[PDB]
Amino acid sequence: GSSGSSGLRRATVECVKDQFGFINYEVGDSKKLFFHVKEVQDGIELQAGDEVEFSVILNQRTGKCSACNVWRVSGPSSG
């Protein structure tokens, strides 16, 4: 019913080619999430299949949701 779901989450990215990418995480009407290169910090690159931990922040001014402080939690997967 009515419950505030706040906190860090974990999801993998679908495809990252342009400055903006979509994450495989459903928060509302949309199935995927929307984040910009400005979000990610510490000089990190998010690719397809990269699990990153982001915080769900709801905007009261607009009324939409997005990612913030995107941090690549997934491993290197190189070898």
Curated annotation (Swiss-Prot):
Q: Where in the cell is it found?
A: Cytoplasm; Cytoplasm, Stress granule; Cytoplasm, P-body
Regarding protein family, the annotation reads: Belongs to the UNR family.
Q: What does this protein do?
A: RNA-binding protein involved in translationally coupled mRNA turnover. Implicated with other RNA-binding proteins in the cytoplasmic deadenylation/translational and decay interplay of the FOS mRNA mediated by the major coding-region determinant of instability (mCRD) domain. Required for efficient formation of stress granules. (Microbial infection) Required for internal initiation of translation of human rhinovirus RNA.
Could you identify this protein by its name?
Answer: Cold shock domain-containing protein E1
Q: What is the lineage of its organism?
A: Eukaryota, Metazoa, Chordata, Craniata, Vertebrata
**What is the protein's quaternary organization?**
Component of a multi subunit autoregulatory ribonucleoprotein complex (ARC), at least composed of IGF2BP1, PABPC1 and CSDE1. Interacts with STRAP. Part of a complex associated with the FOS mCRD domain and consisting of PABPC1, PAIP1, HNRPD and SYNCRIP. The interaction with PABPC1 is direct and RNA-independent. Interacts with EIF4ENIF1/4E-T.
Residue limits of the CSD domain? 9-70
Instruction: Identify the domain of life.
Output: Eukaryota
